[PDB]
Short mmCIF file of C-alpha atoms in Angstrom, two decimals:
data_model
loop_
_atom_site.label_atom_id
_atom_site.label_comp_id
_atom_site.label_asym_id
_atom_site.label_seq_id
_atom_site.Cartn_x
_atom_site.Cartn_y
_atom_site.Cartn_z
CA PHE A 289 0.00 0.00 0.00
CA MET A 290 0.92 3.68 -0.31
CA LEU A 291 0.81 6.49 2.25
CA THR A 292 -0.18 9.82 0.70
CA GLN A 293 0.62 13.16 2.35
CA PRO A 294 0.13 16.77 1.25
CA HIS A 295 3.19 18.17 -0.49
CA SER A 296 3.60 21.17 1.81
CA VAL A 297 2.02 23.03 4.72
CA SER A 298 2.72 26.49 6.10
CA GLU A 299 1.49 28.66 8.96
CA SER A 300 2.62 31.49 11.25
CA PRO A 301 4.33 31.14 14.64
CA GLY A 302 1.93 30.30 17.45
CA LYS A 303 -0.79 28.86 15.20
CA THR A 304 -1.63 25.21 14.48
CA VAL A 305 -1.20 22.94 11.45
CA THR A 306 -2.25 19.38 10.69
CA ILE A 307 -0.55 17.01 8.25
CA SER A 308 -2.66 14.09 7.03
CA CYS A 309 -1.54 10.67 5.81
CA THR A 310 -3.99 8.52 3.83
CA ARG A 311 -3.60 4.76 3.43
CA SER A 312 -4.41 3.63 -0.10
CA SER A 313 -5.00 -0.10 0.45
CA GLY A 314 -6.05 -1.82 3.66
CA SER A 315 -7.14 -0.44 7.01
CA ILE A 316 -5.31 2.45 8.66
CA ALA A 317 -6.20 1.15 12.13
CA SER A 318 -4.73 -2.22 11.09
CA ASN A 319 -1.14 -1.14 11.72
CA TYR A 320 0.69 1.33 13.92
CA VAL A 321 1.50 4.73 12.41
CA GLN A 322 4.69 6.69 13.15
CA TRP A 323 5.70 10.27 12.40
CA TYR A 324 9.25 11.52 11.84
CA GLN A 325 10.60 15.06 11.82
CA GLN A 326 13.49 15.83 9.45
CA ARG A 327 15.17 19.23 9.59
CA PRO A 328 17.43 20.39 6.74
CA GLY A 329 20.65 18.39 6.52
CA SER A 330 19.59 16.25 9.49
CA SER A 331 18.66 12.65 10.14
CA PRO A 332 15.00 12.00 11.04
CA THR A 333 13.61 12.11 14.58
CA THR A 334 10.63 10.09 15.79
CA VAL A 335 8.02 12.61 16.91
CA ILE A 336 4.94 10.36 17.18
CA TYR A 337 4.72 6.57 17.33
CA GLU A 338 2.04 3.90 17.77
CA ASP A 339 -0.57 6.32 16.37
CA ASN A 340 -0.63 8.85 19.22
CA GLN A 341 2.38 8.29 21.52
CA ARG A 342 5.12 10.89 22.13
CA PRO A 343 8.70 9.77 22.79
CA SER A 344 10.40 11.40 25.75
CA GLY A 345 11.73 14.82 24.81
CA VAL A 346 8.93 15.66 22.35
CA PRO A 347 6.60 18.47 23.49
CA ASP A 348 2.85 17.97 23.87
CA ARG A 349 2.38 20.50 21.07
CA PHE A 350 2.86 17.43 18.85
CA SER A 351 -0.16 15.11 18.72
CA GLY A 352 -1.16 12.22 16.46
CA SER A 353 -4.57 10.81 15.60
CA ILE A 354 -6.36 8.27 13.40
CA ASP A 355 -9.56 8.71 11.37
CA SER A 356 -10.94 5.40 10.09
CA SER A 357 -13.51 7.51 8.23
CA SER A 358 -10.99 8.69 5.63
CA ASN A 359 -8.42 5.92 6.28
CA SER A 360 -6.18 8.71 7.50
CA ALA A 361 -3.57 9.35 10.15
CA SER A 362 -2.86 12.94 11.14
CA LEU A 363 -0.08 14.86 12.86
CA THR A 364 -1.03 18.10 14.62
CA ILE A 365 1.37 20.77 15.91
CA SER A 366 0.00 23.55 18.12
CA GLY A 367 1.82 26.81 18.84
CA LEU A 368 4.28 26.53 15.96
CA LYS A 369 7.89 27.34 16.81
CA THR A 370 10.73 28.18 14.44
CA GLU A 371 12.33 24.81 15.21
CA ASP A 372 9.18 23.06 13.94
CA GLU A 373 10.09 23.99 10.34
CA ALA A 374 11.08 20.64 8.83
CA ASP A 375 9.86 17.81 6.62
CA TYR A 376 7.42 15.37 8.21
CA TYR A 377 7.06 11.72 7.18
CA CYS A 378 4.38 9.25 8.24
CA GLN A 379 4.98 5.51 8.09
CA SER A 380 3.24 2.24 8.92
CA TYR A 381 3.73 -1.52 8.73
CA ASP A 382 2.23 -3.94 6.21
CA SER A 383 1.67 -7.70 6.11
CA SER A 384 5.49 -7.71 6.12
CA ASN A 385 6.50 -4.40 4.52
CA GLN A 386 7.47 -0.92 5.72
CA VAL A 387 5.86 2.04 3.93
CA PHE A 388 6.80 5.71 4.22
CA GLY A 389 4.63 8.61 3.22
CA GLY A 390 5.87 10.90 0.48
CA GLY A 391 6.66 13.53 3.11
CA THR A 392 5.31 17.00 3.85
CA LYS A 393 7.31 20.23 3.95
CA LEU A 394 6.28 22.42 6.89
CA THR A 395 7.24 26.09 6.62
CA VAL A 396 6.94 28.31 9.69
CA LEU A 397 6.22 31.62 7.98
CA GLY A 398 8.82 34.28 8.75
CA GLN A 399 8.06 36.62 5.85
CA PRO A 400 5.04 37.28 3.61
CA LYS A 401 4.30 34.64 1.01
CA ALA A 402 5.58 35.30 -2.49
CA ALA A 403 4.48 33.89 -5.84
CA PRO A 404 7.13 32.48 -8.18
CA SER A 405 8.43 34.47 -11.12
CA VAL A 406 8.74 32.14 -14.11
CA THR A 407 10.83 32.68 -17.25
CA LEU A 408 10.80 30.00 -19.96
CA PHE A 409 13.45 29.93 -22.69
CA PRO A 410 13.06 27.94 -25.92
CA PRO A 411 15.99 25.96 -27.34
CA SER A 412 18.65 28.22 -28.79
CA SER A 413 19.27 27.79 -32.50
CA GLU A 414 22.92 27.11 -31.64
CA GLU A 415 21.73 24.08 -29.67
CA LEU A 416 19.19 23.11 -32.35
CA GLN A 417 21.97 23.19 -34.95
CA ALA A 418 23.94 20.78 -32.73
CA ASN A 419 21.03 18.28 -32.88
CA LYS A 420 19.98 19.11 -29.30
CA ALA A 421 17.04 20.95 -27.75
CA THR A 422 16.54 21.93 -24.11
CA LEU A 423 13.68 23.97 -22.65
CA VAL A 424 14.79 25.97 -19.61
CA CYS A 425 12.21 27.00 -16.99
CA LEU A 426 13.61 29.34 -14.34
CA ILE A 427 11.62 29.82 -11.12
CA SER A 428 12.60 32.37 -8.50
CA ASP A 429 11.46 34.64 -5.66
CA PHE A 430 8.91 32.25 -4.14
CA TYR A 431 8.14 31.60 -0.47
CA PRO A 432 7.55 29.10 1.08
CA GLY A 433 10.14 27.02 -0.75
CA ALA A 434 7.82 24.31 -2.05
CA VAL A 435 6.81 24.03 -5.71
CA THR A 436 5.76 21.28 -8.07
CA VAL A 437 6.65 21.64 -11.76
CA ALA A 438 4.81 19.97 -14.63
CA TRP A 439 5.27 20.20 -18.39
CA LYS A 440 2.94 20.04 -21.38
CA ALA A 441 3.54 19.38 -25.06
CA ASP A 442 0.62 21.22 -26.61
CA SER A 443 -2.12 20.05 -24.21
CA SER A 444 -0.60 16.71 -23.19
CA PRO A 445 1.36 16.19 -19.94
CA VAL A 446 5.01 15.36 -20.61
CA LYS A 447 6.06 12.10 -18.96
CA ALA A 448 9.78 11.91 -19.80
CA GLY A 449 12.81 14.13 -20.24
CA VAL A 450 12.12 16.38 -17.24
CA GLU A 451 14.80 17.29 -14.69
CA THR A 452 13.86 19.61 -11.83
CA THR A 453 15.86 20.99 -8.91
CA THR A 454 14.66 21.19 -5.35
CA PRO A 455 14.20 24.74 -4.04
CA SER A 456 17.39 26.56 -3.05
CA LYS A 457 17.41 29.52 -0.70
CA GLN A 458 18.50 32.76 -2.38
CA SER A 459 20.02 35.77 -0.65
CA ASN A 460 16.70 37.59 -0.12
CA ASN A 461 15.55 34.48 1.84
CA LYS A 462 13.11 33.49 -0.91
CA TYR A 463 13.71 30.39 -3.05
CA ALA A 464 14.74 29.51 -6.60
CA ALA A 465 14.38 26.37 -8.71
CA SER A 466 14.91 25.11 -12.25
CA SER A 467 13.20 22.62 -14.56
CA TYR A 468 14.62 21.33 -17.83
CA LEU A 469 12.83 19.52 -20.67
CA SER A 470 15.03 17.71 -23.21
CA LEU A 471 13.82 17.13 -26.77
CA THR A 472 15.25 16.41 -30.15
CA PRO A 473 15.06 19.19 -32.76
CA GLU A 474 12.43 17.12 -34.58
CA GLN A 475 10.21 16.90 -31.49
CA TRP A 476 10.55 20.63 -30.79
CA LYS A 477 9.50 21.63 -34.31
CA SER A 478 6.65 19.08 -34.53
CA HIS A 479 4.55 20.65 -31.73
CA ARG A 480 2.63 23.92 -31.66
CA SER A 481 3.70 24.79 -28.10
CA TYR A 482 5.33 23.60 -24.88
CA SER A 483 4.46 24.75 -21.37
CA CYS A 484 6.16 24.90 -17.99
CA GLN A 485 3.57 24.92 -15.18
CA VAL A 486 4.68 25.94 -11.67
CA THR A 487 2.29 25.23 -8.79
CA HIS A 488 2.88 27.16 -5.56
CA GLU A 489 0.44 27.20 -2.62
CA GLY A 490 -2.39 25.76 -4.70
CA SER A 491 -2.00 28.23 -7.58
CA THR A 492 -0.24 27.79 -10.91
CA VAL A 493 1.86 30.00 -13.20
CA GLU A 494 2.09 28.64 -16.75
CA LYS A 495 4.62 29.89 -19.30
CA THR A 496 4.44 28.79 -22.94
CA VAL A 497 6.90 28.90 -25.83
CA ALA A 498 6.36 27.94 -29.44
CA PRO A 499 8.72 26.91 -32.27
CA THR A 500 7.08 29.56 -34.48
CA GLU A 501 6.98 32.62 -32.19
CA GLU B 99 23.10 6.92 25.10
CA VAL B 100 22.06 5.19 21.87
CA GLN B 101 24.62 5.50 19.10
CA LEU B 102 24.47 4.38 15.44
CA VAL B 103 27.79 5.06 13.68
CA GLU B 104 27.44 4.51 9.94
CA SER B 105 30.49 4.03 7.74
CA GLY B 106 31.42 2.96 4.24
CA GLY B 107 30.19 4.33 0.98
CA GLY B 108 31.41 6.83 -1.60
CA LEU B 109 31.61 6.87 -5.37
CA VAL B 110 31.12 3.67 -7.38
CA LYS B 111 30.38 2.86 -11.00
CA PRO B 112 27.01 1.24 -11.74
CA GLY B 113 27.31 -2.52 -11.29
CA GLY B 114 29.89 -2.27 -8.50
CA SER B 115 29.78 -3.26 -4.85
CA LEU B 116 29.87 -1.43 -1.53
CA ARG B 117 29.56 -2.65 2.05
CA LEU B 118 28.05 -0.34 4.64
CA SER B 119 28.40 -0.94 8.36
CA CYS B 120 26.48 0.42 11.35
CA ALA B 121 28.18 0.27 14.75
CA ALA B 122 25.77 0.42 17.68
CA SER B 123 26.12 1.24 21.38
CA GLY B 124 23.69 2.02 24.18
CA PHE B 125 21.32 -0.93 23.63
CA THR B 126 21.66 -4.70 23.49
CA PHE B 127 22.11 -4.92 19.72
CA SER B 128 21.65 -8.71 19.79
CA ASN B 129 18.06 -8.39 21.00
CA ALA B 130 17.23 -5.59 18.56
CA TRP B 131 15.63 -5.48 15.14
CA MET B 132 17.66 -3.34 12.73
CA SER B 133 16.61 -1.66 9.49
CA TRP B 134 18.21 0.27 6.64
CA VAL B 135 16.49 3.36 5.21
CA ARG B 136 17.71 5.50 2.31
CA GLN B 137 16.97 9.01 1.04
CA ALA B 138 17.90 10.17 -2.45
CA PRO B 139 18.93 13.85 -2.71
CA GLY B 140 15.85 16.05 -2.45
CA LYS B 141 13.58 13.00 -2.21
CA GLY B 142 11.80 11.05 0.53
CA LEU B 143 12.56 8.20 2.90
CA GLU B 144 12.48 4.72 1.36
CA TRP B 145 12.76 1.54 3.41
CA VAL B 146 15.57 -0.73 2.21
CA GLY B 147 15.27 -3.76 4.47
CA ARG B 148 15.23 -5.21 7.95
CA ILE B 149 16.97 -8.04 9.77
CA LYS B 150 15.39 -9.46 12.91
CA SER B 151 17.09 -10.44 16.15
CA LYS B 152 18.83 -13.80 16.12
CA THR B 153 16.43 -14.72 18.93
CA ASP B 154 13.49 -14.23 16.54
CA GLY B 155 15.14 -16.25 13.75
CA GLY B 156 17.30 -13.48 12.29
CA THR B 157 15.80 -13.70 8.80
CA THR B 158 15.75 -10.68 6.50
CA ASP B 159 13.17 -8.64 4.62
CA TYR B 160 13.83 -6.43 1.61
CA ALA B 161 12.11 -3.69 -0.33
CA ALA B 162 11.33 -4.58 -3.94
CA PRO B 163 13.93 -2.23 -5.56
CA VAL B 164 16.79 -3.99 -3.72
CA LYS B 165 15.66 -7.63 -3.85
CA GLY B 166 18.27 -9.92 -5.38
CA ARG B 167 20.87 -7.12 -5.23
CA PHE B 168 21.32 -6.01 -1.61
CA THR B 169 22.13 -8.29 1.33
CA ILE B 170 21.58 -7.44 5.00
CA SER B 171 23.45 -9.32 7.72
CA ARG B 172 24.51 -8.73 11.31
CA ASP B 173 27.43 -9.58 13.59
CA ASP B 174 25.64 -9.04 16.89
CA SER B 175 28.74 -10.13 18.76
CA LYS B 176 30.42 -6.99 17.38
CA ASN B 177 27.18 -4.96 17.60
CA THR B 178 27.45 -4.17 13.89
CA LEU B 179 24.80 -4.11 11.16
CA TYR B 180 25.83 -4.54 7.52
CA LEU B 181 24.34 -3.64 4.15
CA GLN B 182 26.03 -5.51 1.29
CA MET B 183 25.21 -3.55 -1.87
CA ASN B 184 25.73 -5.52 -5.09
CA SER B 185 24.67 -4.71 -8.66
CA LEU B 186 24.57 -1.01 -7.86
CA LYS B 187 22.41 1.21 -10.06
CA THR B 188 22.57 4.99 -10.31
CA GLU B 189 19.08 4.90 -8.78
CA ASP B 190 20.73 3.68 -5.55
CA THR B 191 22.35 7.09 -4.98
CA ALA B 192 21.16 8.13 -1.52
CA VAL B 193 22.16 8.70 2.08
CA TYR B 194 21.79 5.40 3.93
CA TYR B 195 20.51 5.31 7.51
CA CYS B 196 20.60 2.36 9.87
CA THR B 197 17.69 2.37 12.31
CA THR B 198 16.47 0.38 15.29
CA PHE B 199 12.46 3.01 13.25
CA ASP B 200 12.82 4.83 16.59
CA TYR B 201 16.55 5.68 16.45
CA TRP B 202 18.50 6.80 13.37
CA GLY B 203 22.17 7.03 12.49
CA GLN B 204 23.69 10.08 10.85
CA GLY B 205 23.88 8.33 7.47
CA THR B 206 26.58 7.71 4.88
CA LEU B 207 26.42 8.97 1.30
CA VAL B 208 26.50 6.42 -1.53
CA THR B 209 26.87 7.95 -4.99
CA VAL B 210 26.57 5.66 -8.02
CA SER B 211 27.66 7.43 -11.20
CA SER B 212 29.28 6.42 -14.47
CA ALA B 213 30.23 10.05 -15.16
CA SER B 214 33.80 11.31 -15.52
CA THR B 215 35.29 14.75 -16.10
CA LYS B 216 33.54 16.63 -18.92
CA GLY B 217 33.50 20.33 -19.71
CA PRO B 218 30.16 22.05 -20.25
CA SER B 219 28.35 23.05 -23.40
CA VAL B 220 27.36 26.72 -23.21
CA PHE B 221 24.39 28.02 -25.20
CA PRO B 222 22.92 31.54 -25.24
CA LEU B 223 19.42 32.20 -23.92
CA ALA B 224 18.74 35.10 -26.24
CA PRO B 225 16.44 37.95 -25.16
CA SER B 226 13.31 38.30 -27.27
CA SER B 227 10.00 40.05 -26.71
CA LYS B 228 9.01 36.72 -25.10
CA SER B 229 11.73 37.28 -22.49
CA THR B 230 10.62 40.86 -21.76
CA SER B 231 8.06 41.72 -19.08
CA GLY B 232 7.56 45.42 -18.75
CA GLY B 233 10.60 47.19 -20.09
CA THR B 234 12.91 44.56 -18.60
CA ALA B 235 14.46 41.82 -20.75
CA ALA B 236 15.69 38.42 -19.57
CA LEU B 237 18.82 36.92 -21.12
CA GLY B 238 21.06 34.11 -20.00
CA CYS B 239 23.40 31.21 -20.65
CA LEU B 240 22.64 27.48 -20.55
CA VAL B 241 25.54 25.50 -19.08
CA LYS B 242 24.87 21.95 -20.24
CA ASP B 243 26.26 18.48 -19.52
CA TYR B 244 29.30 18.95 -17.30
CA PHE B 245 30.92 16.90 -14.53
CA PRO B 246 31.84 17.28 -11.77
CA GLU B 247 30.62 20.29 -9.83
CA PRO B 248 31.33 23.20 -9.53
CA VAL B 249 30.77 25.79 -12.26
CA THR B 250 31.32 29.53 -11.84
CA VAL B 251 29.43 32.07 -13.97
CA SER B 252 30.17 35.79 -14.21
CA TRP B 253 28.83 38.33 -16.70
CA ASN B 254 30.99 40.73 -18.74
CA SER B 255 34.09 39.61 -16.79
CA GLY B 256 32.39 40.44 -13.50
CA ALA B 257 31.61 44.05 -14.46
CA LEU B 258 27.89 43.19 -14.67
CA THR B 259 26.50 41.98 -11.34
CA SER B 260 23.10 43.68 -10.96
CA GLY B 261 20.13 41.47 -11.73
CA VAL B 262 22.30 38.36 -12.18
CA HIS B 263 20.89 35.06 -10.90
CA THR B 264 22.85 31.84 -11.39
CA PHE B 265 20.66 28.85 -10.55
CA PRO B 266 21.92 25.78 -8.68
CA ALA B 267 22.68 22.89 -11.00
CA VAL B 268 20.31 20.04 -11.73
CA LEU B 269 21.77 16.53 -11.56
CA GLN B 270 20.55 14.63 -14.60
CA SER B 271 19.65 10.96 -14.97
CA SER B 272 22.76 10.74 -17.17
CA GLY B 273 25.00 11.68 -14.23
CA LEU B 274 25.95 15.04 -15.76
CA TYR B 275 25.10 18.49 -14.44
CA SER B 276 23.28 21.35 -16.12
CA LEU B 277 23.08 24.93 -14.91
CA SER B 278 21.57 28.25 -16.00
CA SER B 279 22.59 31.85 -15.34
CA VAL B 280 20.16 34.63 -16.21
CA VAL B 281 20.39 38.42 -15.97
CA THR B 282 17.59 40.97 -16.31
CA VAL B 283 18.47 44.22 -18.08
CA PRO B 284 16.63 47.23 -19.52
CA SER B 285 15.27 46.27 -22.92
CA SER B 286 16.51 49.66 -24.19
CA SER B 287 20.14 48.52 -23.75
CA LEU B 288 19.90 45.37 -25.88
CA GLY B 289 20.87 47.46 -28.90
CA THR B 290 23.51 49.46 -27.03
CA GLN B 291 25.16 46.94 -24.67
CA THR B 292 27.17 43.75 -25.19
CA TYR B 293 26.40 40.83 -22.85
CA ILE B 294 28.84 37.94 -22.39
CA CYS B 295 28.65 35.15 -19.81
CA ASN B 296 31.93 33.74 -18.50
CA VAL B 297 31.57 30.06 -17.56
CA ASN B 298 34.47 28.53 -15.63
CA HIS B 299 34.60 24.76 -15.07
CA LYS B 300 37.90 24.24 -13.26
CA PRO B 301 37.68 20.40 -12.97
CA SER B 302 38.04 20.18 -16.77
CA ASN B 303 40.28 23.28 -17.10
CA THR B 304 37.61 24.75 -19.39
CA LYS B 305 36.41 28.35 -19.54
CA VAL B 306 33.81 29.51 -22.06
CA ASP B 307 32.92 33.12 -22.93
CA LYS B 308 29.57 33.11 -24.76
CA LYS B 309 28.19 36.26 -26.38
CA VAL B 310 24.41 36.53 -25.92
CA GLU B 311 22.70 38.55 -28.63
CA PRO B 312 19.10 39.73 -29.17
CA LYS B 313 16.88 37.79 -31.55
#
């Protein structure tokens, strides 16, 4: 089975967030659910175990729960502190497996939110004349530092040839990222348009280029 | 009091071997179930496998991506857990944690790459009217297919620094790096000003000066 989490969550100091974790196959109550905190560059810490239990040294701001209704486990953090900013992973046991959730990025807001600025470059003719073609999608000035990037050839979602960086903190404390789509010159010229779609806090910026414009 | 000291791991070609070891203190390692968990750069936690205490039979379980290729064993007289990595793929590149999953080691990095030193290809990202928002034009340089890191990018021999943004490199499925540097300038100076990116890739003793011209 899979454990599905929201990609990212953000809130201000002092407030309260909840990260959910949905089991795809089988009962959520069937097996114990654990939660791990992972700060940047750090190994994970157990923050909740056996559904709702706190290990010693974890504050009672952290609380776990189970909802059989939606086959969901949830992690709740009251009175957010700066040190709570981390990635949070749920995990459970299977008939003999060990499944981790995809993880959830928790940002403790320290500045106003900021939408990404997106600039999409078509393949240069220099590259096209060397039998190569790369679409460059530059994303910058966004906060929190959590985006998902998708691509489209005309109206179809592109399923191969996509390389995307994780967000990197720039000097103004916002974040930058990059996505690349590789094509052959024949593929580039045989489509009316290509699109880079950047989703940030539930909203999307799409930039399009075309071989003819 | 609990300690999990990982060791082993580094670079390796695809198809090679590596043995990781996890030294434990602060708990009776013999009576303990031990697991390996890995995390690819910028990705999530993925369970690798578990070995059970020799009291409980000491048999091993494995995640599907490592079945037939990775072997987990234990020398619980020496309080050491092992991960024998055979038939390494580039997809195995990750930090590897040993766990007991309440307690976690600090992890060792295993990088599987067939790449060797290669200078970059530099292409201009020419300003058009489809790079211009307001009266500001975006122009840049694409720094393609190099290895290893790092690459340095300046503009006009460092005389142009305002509005310059060099983006961290992406690591491609091929094992090579790509990188972009972009600078925003007044569109009214595209006809009056020359823009050149200076790309320095010291590992290959390559430097490229690429003129970027309007379309």
